[PDB]
């Protein structure tokens, strides 16, 4: 009944449309098992959120680089930041791994044991780490505006918007990597070059995508 | 998927993956630490 | 129930009433070395001895070292104090170690026999009348008599708290000494020197920049 | 959990602080006084630290106040942190040993009365001399209160004592901080700040050294 | 009942009880009760701050036309040092904000004067203290509340416009109004910039990047200059 990825084909039995952004897309049956599907749902949500942040940051920095603001490209921002400011790269790596390890370990053990991080062993906080659903950690900290604890229909609509935007952002990040590997310039530079002449400045004329061209 | 994982859990597949992992670890150790004779 | 990993499955051998009576029980046993109750009791004794020895050693390294930074003392580094002390000494290190081994072996053998049989050191007519005070309390590793002269263990209300302050501190000391060794093999200076060097610039003086702890970077 | 004064009007104070101790305002965000025995010990610790800090602040501020006027005596220009390396009639080591023995005697007597109230009210030498039977730990009385000031409102006076003691403890901490940062005596810092408070603050002085 | 869109259905959580209720919540931020209670105070405080700020900016330009409001924090010299003023403002603002926050989380708990026991605010609602804060109330309370929230929303948009006009043209509100009134067809934002798939032109940031204030080099960048149209 619901729209699927490939029209005419029935959706798989393990995808009944309950999850957000369900289009029956699983030809390899990777998420056929329920626990594996739950783990993959959390993985897809984390991937989409990280890709959304990365895409927004890349677009903003590219916007600042195109106008005379002095911003660097996304493929040179790390070197520019580490060299412009007296910042030690291994120290930053260790700090990020410490913070990410704490947050990810708490999320992991909450996935293994739901609601286990709400006991209060972390500075006395209880309701802020209870977790609403799998991959959707509601509370006053992660959701200070309370958009997940009011107007259930709007919450489901926002869930669909989030998963679709995350998938689009993942595709956008892959496009950024491929565009830099092929053209060698920034994403907005590619967009401007395409807008200047769309019939002759594309992937069919870059000389890398189609080798027989 | 359950049957596929069970097939991957069989003795030849497990032995192949384990020996590939062990061989890769020894090869990488000898690559980053060439010619180790004594401790 | 305090746990070393919120959400992790605490082992069954660490949830029994006998194991829960031990101080500092946080359900930390991933290797399962304490599954056997006899092994758990032996390891508890080993942990208590390690805690007390590490606390004494780390105190003897940190307090004189901290006083040496100021003008209170002039004690050399812990990794060099042995040579300095044996230079202007009355005995070589071998003779001193032999006397130490004999004196330590006597008390360690008595403690071992008490571990094998609790209260067995109170055999009448065996230690010139001092055997009456050599009987430990009801808890292994916590004797009274000559030990604990202030009698702070007679009050039960604080007893459970006191033990919690002894194991935890000891565990911290056990890590401290370990750091004292690693830092010695990574910076070549003393612990107070490493602390001051890190406090001067923590964003650039740490284990990520010593060139030893991160050989791949 | 009553109409007693609070350190945060409206906040939910803990229930173990019911106003029995003097100066109870429900201030315990770290919950250090949850254990009744620990709270009983901390009350005596606060009283002793408060009285010693009061004596210290008085002994730090009075010599500097008398030094700034025409009053003169042998130790006048010496600072409170420089009084240790001063020439006295006896060496510092001898005075330290004498005071350690005397304080050992009085502190063991105080501890004996703390673990057992009324068990140290009797003078060991003169059997006739003794303290009154009605007594509480930390409040000896008797010869320690020859003027009989405790015969009046003991609650209000105890509140005044704990408040002045807390203020003096913070003052001594400030003395240490000011001596470590400015490297000058506290009254000189007060005069410097009173000369122009808009340009002499902790932020300005600490930013000038950054 | 007036609405922000005549003929539309207002949200379920907006029943028209709060003042200034016009059924405007497309994102559903006020669906939660606690969130709405917090946002109501946030809107009231924002409204009052913006009203006072806009009135102050207008009076500042009228009284002192030679002093730019955007530069008011730099070209103002007082015998009281900047750090001293910052400390005074920090302590006073901290005291009043903690009292207001406690009244929000615990209604009817900080209405008593801590210095004088004979002064106490009468019972009221969160965000509307009254008592000594309202010595004169001419007219109905609900009508005046609606007037206050409407004027506050207008002042909030006005302050945002003040900041944007000062960053784009480098002039004050009255100066920008006179400049626009002189040439209305060539002074709007559409006349200053335009974006097309082949070219993107934006107005230059009139505010300098760095400002020297007693040898400290305070950075003063235009708000989101890269995203400017
Ligand atoms: C609460 C007590 C107390 C405090 C805060 C200080 C604080 C100080 N004393 Mg001191 N003292 C105190 C008690 C006593 N002192 C002395 C005898 C001395 C002497 C003889 C000297 C000091 C000095 C000092 C200063 C430097 C400390 C030092 O030498 O550190 C090093 C030691 C450690 C860090 C431990 C100063 C900060 C010195 C001074 O005047 O420096 C300018 C100094 O020469 N004190 C005696 C023995 C009667 C004390 C108590 O009985
Ligand atoms: C709601 C308060 C408030 C607002 C909106 C502004 C806005 C402004 N100030 Mg003030 N100021 C404010 C409060 C105050 N300023 C000053 C002292 C100054 C000085 C000394 C200067 C300004 C300047 C500026 C301008 C540049 C801002 C900038 O890029 O800062 C970037 C820095 C920050 C945003 C602060 C750091 C983060 C913050 C959250 C803490 C701008 C129009 C500058 C100017 O004139 O530019 C033309 C300038 O030189 N302000 C004081 C102390 C009395 C304030 C106290 O409340
Ligand atoms: C104080 C150092 C500093 C400097 C020199 C800059 C400079 C710049 N930023 Mg920026 N920014 C900073 C800090 C700084 N930023 C911080 C700490 C944040 C996190 C809140 C941001 C977040 C930010 C965003 C989201 C954007 C910029 C953008 C820009 C560029 C356009 C002008 C502008 O500032 O718009 C102003 C934007 C703001 C958010 C104002 C905040 C900056 C002030 C000074 C507060 C920082 C004080 C901080 C607590 C210390 C410009 C070159 C824009 C850009 O990338 O161009 C495409 C852009 O969209 N910045
Ligand atoms: C039982 C017989 C035997 C023994 C004792 C050795 C011993 C050794 N061989 Mg050899 N070898 C053998 C048979 C044997 N080989 C056979 C039959 C062949 C033909 C396939 C080879 C072919 C061969 C080659 C081509 C090379 C060696 C090398 C070595 C040395 C490598 C040490 C090392 O791996 O680093 C250290 C390994 C570790 C640190 C792994 C530790 C395991 C974990 C990670 C740590 C746990 C420890 C606590 C070592 C002394 C290498 C060499 O350099 O010679 C000197 C090398 O080039 N061997
Ligand atoms: C099990 C813990 C331990 C161990 C193995 C050592 C080992 C050592 N210490 Mg040390 N010490 C310790 C704890 C320890 N200490 C503690 C807890 C403190 C107090 C913070 C000290 C304070 C200290 C100082 C100040 C000095 C040493 C010194 C030394 C070295 C010379 C040996 C010696 O002192 O002659 C043998 C000592 C005795 C036989 C005891 C003599 C009785 C003492 C002086 C009175 C204390 C009474 C008490 C009941 C015992 C030696 C390597 C000295 C050094 O560095 O050498 C250059 C030195 O200056 N230690
Ligand atoms: C328990 C608190 C306390 C402590 C530890 C000290 C400690 C000290 N005081 Mg002090 N003092 C105190 C309270 C205290 N005072 C109070 C409350 C007052 C106000 C009455 C004074 C007024 C005072 C003066 C005027 C002087 C000292 C001085 C001294 C120093 C030498 C004292 C001496 O010569 O022997 C004891 C003296 C007698 C028994 C007589 C010494 C470090 C002297 C100094 O500054 O050192 C150079 C000195 O001139 N004190
Ligand atoms: C009895 C508390 C007390 C008092 C009255 C003072 C007073 C003073 N301090 Mg000080 N200070 C204190 C505690 C105190 N301090 C403590 C606990 C510390 C941490 C160790 C410091 C650390 C400190 C530094 C580093 C400096 C001062 C400095 C100063 C002087 C001026 C600038 C200033 O006020 O900085 C700010 C003071 C504070 C931030 C302390 C916090 C406020 C305390 C807790 C009092 C609480 C207020 C309370 C309602 C009582 C009001 C006063 C009352 C007697 C009427 C000034 C005369 C400066 C100086 O020496 O001038 C040259 C200086 O640089 N103080
Ligand atoms: C500083 C000490 C903080 C402190 O102890 O405050 C005192 C207060 C302690 O309240 P209680 O422990 O009595 O909590 C019981 C109830 O009264 C809660 O209100 O803490 C809070 O106000 C909670 C709000 C967090 C305050 C956040 C700090 C500022 C946020 C910056 C962004
Ligand atoms: C479903 C399925 C199943 C069936 O059965 C089969 C198949 C078909 C196979 C499938 C499919 C799959 C897929 C498609 C996948 C993909 C994914 C992705 C793309 C991801 C990304 C993902 C992505 C991501 C996360 C990303 C992120 C990003 C980021 C962070 C960034 C960052 C940054 C920035 C800002 C800038 C600077 O300067 C630099 C950096 C640092 C660089
Ligand atoms: C629990 C568990 C179980 C699970 O299942 C698994 C696992 C993970 C394996 C685990 C863990 C473990 C661990 C961590 C361990 C460690 C230990 C230690 C560190 C010890 C030390 C320990 C340590 C110690 C005793 C130490 C001691 C020290 C000393 C005496 C010192 C001495 C000295 C001094 C004074 C000075 C001089 O000049 C020098 C000297 C002569 C040098
Ligand atoms: C409480 C009380 C009570 C008692 O009993 C009495 C008393 C004392 C009287 C009191 C007080 C009161 C108050 C404070 C008031 C105030 C108000 C305000 C300020 C308003 C404003 C309000 C304000 C507002 C709306 C504003 C508006 C504005 C605007 C639109 C602007 C516009 C513009 C712009 C953009 C720019 C350009 O270039 C110019 C223009 C075009 C011009």
């Amino acid at each position: 009944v619901r729209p699927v990825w490939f029209p005419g084909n029935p959706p798989p039995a393990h995808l009944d449309g309950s999850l957000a952004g369900d289009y029956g897309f699983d030809p390899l049956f990777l998420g056929q098992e329920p626990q594996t599907l739950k783990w993959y749902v959390q993985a897809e949500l984390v991937h989409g959120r990280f890709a959304m942040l990365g895409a927004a940051g890349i677009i903003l920095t590219s916007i600042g680089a195109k106008v005379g603001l002095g911003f660097p490209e996304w493929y040179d921002a790390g070197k520019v930041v580490v060299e412009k400011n007296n910042i030690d790269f291994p120290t930053l790596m260790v700090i990020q791994f410490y913070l990410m390890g704490w947050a990810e370990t708490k999320r992991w053990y909450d996935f293994k044991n739901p609601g286990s991080q709400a006991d209060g062993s972390f500075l006395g906080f209880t309701e802020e780490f209870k977790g609403l659903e799998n991959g959707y950690p509601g509370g006053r900290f992660f959701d200070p505006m309370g958009l997940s604890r009011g107007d259930a229909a709007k919450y489901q609509e926002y869930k669909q918007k989030e998963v679709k935007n995350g998938r689009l952002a993942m595709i956008a990040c892959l496009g950024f990597a491929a565009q830099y590997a092929a053209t060698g310039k920034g994403p907005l530079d590619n967009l401007a070059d395409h807008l200047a002449d769309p019939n002759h400045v594309n992937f069919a004329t870059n000389g890398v995508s189609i080798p027989i061209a | 998927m359950k049957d596929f994982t069970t097939y991957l859990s069989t003795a030849p597949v497990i032995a192949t993956i384990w020996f590939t992992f062990t061989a890769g670890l020894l090869i990488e150790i000898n690559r980053y630490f060439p010619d180790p004779l004594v401790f | 129930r305090q746990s070393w990993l919120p959400g992790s499955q605490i082992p069954a051998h660490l949830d029994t009433p006998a194991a829960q009576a031990l101080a500092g029980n946080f359900g930390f046993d991933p290797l399962g070395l304490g599954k056997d109750p006899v092994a758990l009791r032996w390891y508890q004794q080993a942990e208590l001895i390690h805690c007390r020895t590490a606390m004494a050693g780390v105190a003897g390294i940190l307090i004189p070292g901290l006083l040496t930074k100021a003008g209170a003392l002039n004690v050399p580094e812990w990794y060099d104090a042995g040579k300095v002390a044996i230079e202007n000494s009355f005995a070589p290190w071998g003779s001193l170690l032999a006397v130490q081994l004999f004196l330590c072996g006597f008390v360690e053998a008595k403690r071992w026999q008490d571990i094998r049989k609790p209260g067995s050191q109170g055999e009448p007519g065996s230690f010139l009348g001092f055997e009456a005070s050599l009987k430990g309390t009801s808890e292994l590793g916590y004797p009274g008599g000559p030990f604990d002269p202030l009698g702070l263990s007679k009050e039960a209300d604080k007893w459970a708290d006191w033990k919690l302050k002894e194991v935890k501190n000891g565990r911290l000391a056990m890590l401290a000494f370990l750091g004292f060794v690693a830092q010695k093999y990574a910076t070549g200076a003393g612990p107070v020197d490493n602390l001051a060097a890190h406090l001067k610039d923590p964003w650039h003086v740490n284990y990520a920049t010593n060139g030893v702890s991160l050989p791949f970077l | 959990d009553a109409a007693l004064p609070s350190w945060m009007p409206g906040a939910d104070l803990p229930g173990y602080l019911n106003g029995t101790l003097p100066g109870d305002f429900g201030f315990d965000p770290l919950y250090l006084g949850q254990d009744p025995v620990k709270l009983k010990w901390y009350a005596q610790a606060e009283l002793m630290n408060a009285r010693f800090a009061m004596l210290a602040v008085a002994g730090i501020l009075v010599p500097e106040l008398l030094s700034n006027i025409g009053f003169s005596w042998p130790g006048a220009g010496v600072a409170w942190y420089d009084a240790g390396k001063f020439e006295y009639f006896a060496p510092a080591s001898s005075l330290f040993g004498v005071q350690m023995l005397l304080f050992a005697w009085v502190e063991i007597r105080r501890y004996q009365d703390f673990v057992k109230p009324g068990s140290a009210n009797q003078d060991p030498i003169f059997t006739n001399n003794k303290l009154p039977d009605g007594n509480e730990p930390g409040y000896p009385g008797g010869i320690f209160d020859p003027f009989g000031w405790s015969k009046g409102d003991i609650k209000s006076l105890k509140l005044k004592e704990i408040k002045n003691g807390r203020l003096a403890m913070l003052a001594f901490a400030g003395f240490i901080g000011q001596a470590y940062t400015t490297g000058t005596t506290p009254l000189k810092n007060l005069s410097t700040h009173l000369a122009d408070p808009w340009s002499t603050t902790v932020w300005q002085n600490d930013l000038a050294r950054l | 009942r007036p609405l922000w869109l005549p003929g539309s259905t207002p949200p379920a959580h907006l029943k028209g009880d709060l003042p200034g209720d016009f059924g405007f919540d497309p994102l559903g931020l006020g669906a939660n009760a606690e969130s709405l209670k917090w946002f109501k105070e946030s809107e009231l405080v924002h409204s009052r701050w913006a009203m006072a700020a806009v009135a102050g900016i207008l009076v500042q330009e009228i009284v002192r036309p030679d002093v730019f409001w955007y530069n008011a924090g730099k070209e103002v010299e007082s015998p009281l040092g900047p750090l001293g003023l910052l400390a005074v403002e920090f302590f006073l603002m901290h005291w009043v904000e903690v009292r207001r926050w406690q009244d929000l989380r615990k209604p009817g708990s900080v209405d008593q004067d801590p210095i004088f026991s004979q002064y106490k605010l009468p019972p009221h609602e969160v965000g509307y203290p009254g008592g000594v804060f309202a010595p004169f109330i001419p007219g109905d309370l609900a009508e005046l509340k609606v007037k206050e929230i409407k004027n506050g929303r207008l002042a909030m948009l006005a302050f945002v416009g003040f900041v944007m006009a000062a960053q784009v043209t480098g002039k004050g509100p009255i100066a920008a109004l006179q400049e626009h009134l002189a040439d209305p067809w060539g002074t709007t934002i559409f006349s200053k910039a335009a974006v097309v798939p082949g070219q993107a032109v934006a107005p230059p940031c009139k505010i300098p990047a760095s400002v020297s204030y007693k040898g400290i080099e305070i950075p003063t960048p235009c708000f989101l200059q890269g995203l400017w149209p």
Side-chain angles (χ1 to χ4, degrees), chain A, chain B, chain C, chain D residues 1-150 152-210, chain E:
Chain A
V1 189
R2 60 168 208 282
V4 287
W5 73 282
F6 187 73
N9 273 345
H14 60 274
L15 297 174
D16 61 357
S18 65
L19 296 152
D22 199 331
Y23 298 103
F25 183 67
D26 202 7
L28 301 183
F29 289 81
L30 301 192
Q32 200 181 7
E33 291 181 288
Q35 294 319 291
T36 315
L37 183 55
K38 207 186 295 181
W39 177 251
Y40 286 167
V41 170
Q42 204 170 9
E44 186 192 14
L45 287 170
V46 167
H47 273 101
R49 285 150 184 161
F50 268 130
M52 277 189 274
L53 293 175
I58 280 163
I59 287 159
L60 199 67
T61 47
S62 292
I63 276 167
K66 272 294 293 180
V67 177
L69 273 298
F71 272 78
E73 299 295 326
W74 73 267
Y75 42 86
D76 304 322
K79 182 178 184 292
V80 161
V81 163
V82 162
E83 281 179 2
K84 187 167 71 175
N85 300 113
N86 217 14
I87 295 173
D88 181 67
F89 165 77
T91 302
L92 191 82
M93 279 281 288
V94 165
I95 292 165
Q96 159 185 345
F97 263 101
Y98 277 11
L99 301 176
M100 283 295 306
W102 190 269
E104 289 293 88
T105 314
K106 288 200 81 65
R107 166 173 87 85
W108 201 358
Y109 273 89
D110 184 274
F111 171 79
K112 299 163 165 280
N113 191 7
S116 50
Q117 311 300 298
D119 45 349
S121 52
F122 174 70
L123 311 178
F125 292 125
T126 47
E127 57 171 22
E128 286 92 340
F129 303 99
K130 188 183 177 303
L132 192 65
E133 302 151 8
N134 169 69
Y136 297 96
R140 281 161 68 254
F141 280 172
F142 303 118
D143 191 18
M145 279 171 179
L147 301 184
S148 73
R149 42 186 184 274
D151 199 6
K154 189 71 72 69
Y155 173 51
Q156 297 293 317
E157 153 179 336
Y158 285 164
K159 279 168 85 185
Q160 186 85 2
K161 284 155 161 194
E162 182 197 26
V163 63
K164 278 156 87 168
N165 273 278
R167 285 156 183 184
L168 181 61
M170 285 187 259
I171 296 301
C173 282
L174 178 64
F176 293 149
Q179 276 169 235
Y180 173 55
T183 62
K185 319 182 189 73
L188 282 196
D189 265 327
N190 303 144
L191 176 69
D193 273 339
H194 188 61
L195 281 164
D197 195 13
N199 295 350
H200 311 107
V201 187
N202 48 8
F203 87 102
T205 57
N206 60 2
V208 185
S209 293
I210 303 169
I212 64 175
Chain B
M1 184 45 89
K2 185 256 293 180
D3 293 317
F4 188 65
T5 51
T6 316
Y7 157 74
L8 290 178
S9 308
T10 49
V13 180
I14 284 296
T16 292
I17 293 171
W18 196 243
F19 285 152
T20 307
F21 160 77
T22 311
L25 174 63
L26 281 183
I27 283 154
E28 290 298 318
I29 280 166
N30 274 273
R31 167 159 83 99
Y32 281 96
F33 300 86
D35 302 331
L37 183 57
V38 288
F39 185 78
Chain C
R1 175 74 168 107
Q2 267 143 11
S3 171
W4 79 284
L5 208 48
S8 77
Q9 167 63 39
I10 301 285
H13 68 264
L14 278 191
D15 272 328
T16 63
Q20 268 178 8
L22 308 174
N25 197 324
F26 299 118
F28 176 60
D29 201 9
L31 296 190
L33 304 162
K35 272 158 193 149
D36 189 32
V38 187
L40 180 62
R41 177 173 164 267
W42 179 254
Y43 293 155
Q44 201 253 332
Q45 297 307 298
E47 190 196 22
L48 284 182
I49 297 296
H50 276 102
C51 278
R52 287 142 179 175
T53 318
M55 276 187 285
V58 169
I61 290 170
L62 202 42
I63 297 144
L66 277 168
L67 290 188
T68 312
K69 184 75 193 303
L73 283 180
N74 210 64
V75 174
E77 304 286 347
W78 72 270
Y79 46 87
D80 292 334
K83 177 170 165 297
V84 178
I86 207 67
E87 264 153 13
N88 53 348
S89 193
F90 58 91
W93 74 270
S95 178
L96 205 67
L97 188 47
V99 176
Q100 168 182 353
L101 276 174
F102 290 165
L103 287 174
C104 286
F106 196 82
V107 307
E108 282 299 281
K110 292 185 77 56
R111 183 174 69 79
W112 203 355
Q113 193 52 43
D114 179 79
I115 280 173
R116 280 166 45 85
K117 291 167 80 182
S120 64
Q121 293 313 286
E123 168 168 14
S126 67
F127 203 70
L128 308 168
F130 205 68
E131 64 265 2
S133 312
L134 292 184
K135 315 176 300 214
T137 59
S138 59
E139 324 184 28
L140 203 64
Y142 301 97
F147 323 102
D148 188 43
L150 284 181
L152 302 191
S153 43
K154 318 285 186 57
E155 294 178 353
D157 48 352
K158 331 201 181 88
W159 178 237
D161 196 71
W162 277 127
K163 293 190 284 183
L164 192 45
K165 299 177 156 168
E166 182 189 23
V167 186
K168 259 161 97 177
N169 263 277
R171 277 156 186 188
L172 187 55
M174 269 191 280
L175 293 157
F177 180 75
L178 184 48
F180 292 165
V181 175
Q183 288 171 217
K184 181 206 160 291
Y185 279 111
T187 52
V192 185
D193 278 327
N194 298 152
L195 174 62
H198 182 71
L199 280 178
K200 198 164 182 161
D201 195 10
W203 325 98
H204 299 90
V205 185
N206 47 20
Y207 74 105
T209 69
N210 56 8
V212 190
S213 312
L214 290 183
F216 57 92
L217 280 175
Chain D
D1 299 17
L4 58 86
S6 164
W7 73 284
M8 209 177 176
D12 309 333
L13 317 171
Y16 49 82
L17 297 175
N18 45 358
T20 56
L21 295 171
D24 183 28
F25 305 118
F27 175 62
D28 212 3
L30 291 191
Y31 298 90
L32 308 181
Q34 269 175 342
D35 212 332
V37 287
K38 282 186 161 172
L39 175 61
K40 167 184 173 175
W41 175 265
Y42 292 157
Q44 302 296 319
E46 184 189 15
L47 207 50
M48 285 289 290
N49 272 282
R51 281 157 182 175
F52 270 124
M54 279 187 271
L55 282 170
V57 172
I60 280 168
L61 291 183
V62 162
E64 192 157 349
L65 185 70
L66 295 186
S67 168
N68 298 341
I69 55 180
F71 278 2
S72 70
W73 66 102
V78 59
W80 68 267
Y81 42 78
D82 282 338
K85 54 176 187 67
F86 191 81
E87 284 98 352
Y88 297 101
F89 85 109
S93 65
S94 182
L95 306 151
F96 179 77
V98 168
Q99 75 190 2
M100 208 44 62
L101 296 177
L102 301 174
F103 281 110
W105 175 273
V106 303
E107 284 298 293
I108 292 303
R109 287 288 295 201
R110 189 181 58 85
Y111 181 67
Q112 174 63 36
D113 190 274
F114 166 70
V115 295
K116 209 185 168 207
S119 74
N121 294 344
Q122 171 76 84
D123 179 10
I125 299 180
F126 307 94
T127 52
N128 51 336
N129 292 325
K130 73 172 285 191
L131 297 178
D133 282 337
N135 261 341
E136 317 282 345
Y139 303 106
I143 190 169
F144 297 91
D145 199 349
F147 285 83
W149 264 73
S150 66
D153 200 2
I154 191 68
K155 187 159 165 179
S156 159
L157 290 161
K158 271 187 195 184
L159 173 65
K160 291 186 181 102
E161 181 195 44
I162 195 64
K163 280 202 191 165
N164 285 277
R166 285 154 174 174
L167 187 47
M169 282 189 272
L170 277 193
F172 192 73
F175 286 170
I176 303 165
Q178 284 169 224
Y180 205 64
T181 60
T182 72
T184 307
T185 68
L187 274 190
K188 276 300 170 197
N189 302 136
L190 175 63
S191 82
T192 305
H193 176 77
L194 271 178
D196 197 76
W198 315 108
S199 59
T200 49
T201 48
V202 61
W203 294 347
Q204 179 76 264
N205 297 331
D206 276 322
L207 267 172
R209 314 192 278 115
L210 190 78
Chain E
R1 197 257 302 262
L3 293 177
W4 81 282
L5 207 73
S8 67
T9 63
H13 60 270
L14 291 169
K15 291 104 169 171
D17 314 331
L18 310 177
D21 203 326
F22 298 117
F24 179 66
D25 203 3
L27 302 193
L29 308 179
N32 201 257
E34 310 303 314
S35 289
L36 185 73
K37 184 191 294 192
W38 173 267
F39 295 156
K40 193 174 75 75
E41 180 100 2
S42 196
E43 190 190 9
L44 276 157
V45 172
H46 275 100
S47 283
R48 284 144 169 157
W49 270 122
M51 279 186 279
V54 168
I57 285 167
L58 298 175
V59 172
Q60 269 171 63
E61 189 161 26
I62 286 293
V63 163
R64 308 275 292 277
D66 52 311
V67 165
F68 193 19
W69 74 268
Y70 208 96
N71 296 318
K74 166 199 80 187
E75 55 206 31
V76 167
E77 171 63 38
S78 177
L80 287 69
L83 275 169
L85 296 163
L86 185 81
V88 169
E89 175 192 325
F90 163 72
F91 280 123
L92 302 195
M93 281 313 295
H94 187 274
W95 171 267
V96 301
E97 288 304 276
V98 171
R99 293 284 289 191
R100 184 176 63 79
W101 175 63
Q102 191 84 333
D103 181 68
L104 187 154
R105 62 212 299 261
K106 292 146 183 293
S109 62
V110 286
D111 282 357
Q112 182 70 52
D113 183 5
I115 307 299
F116 307 91
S117 65
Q118 42 174 343
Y119 293 127
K120 188 207 172 61
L121 293 186
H124 59 88
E125 318 187 4
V126 186
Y128 299 106
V132 72
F133 285 85
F136 188 36
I137 315 177
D140 198 72
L141 205 66
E143 195 208 73
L144 272 165
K145 274 177 191 191
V146 169
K147 289 162 150 179
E148 179 202 35
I149 194 71
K150 283 168 81 178
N151 267 273
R153 285 150 177 175
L154 189 59
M156 281 190 268
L157 301 167
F159 180 75
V160 164
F162 281 7
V163 168
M164 275 315 115
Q167 289 187 351
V168 165
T169 80
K171 307 185 171 179
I174 296 89
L177 185 141
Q178 297 288 100
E179 186 186 7
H180 166 69
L181 185 62
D183 189 20
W185 289 72
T187 51
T188 76
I189 187 55
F190 281 17
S191 313
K192 295 160 158 54
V195 178
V196 290
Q199 193 167 0
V201 62
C205 166
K206 299 293 182 68
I207 306 300
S210 164
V211 168
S212 186
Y213 183 80
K214 305 186 170 69
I216 209 62
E217 290 270 335
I218 279 168
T220 58
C222 283
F223 197 66
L224 313 179
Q225 195 196 340
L227 297 169
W228 275 9

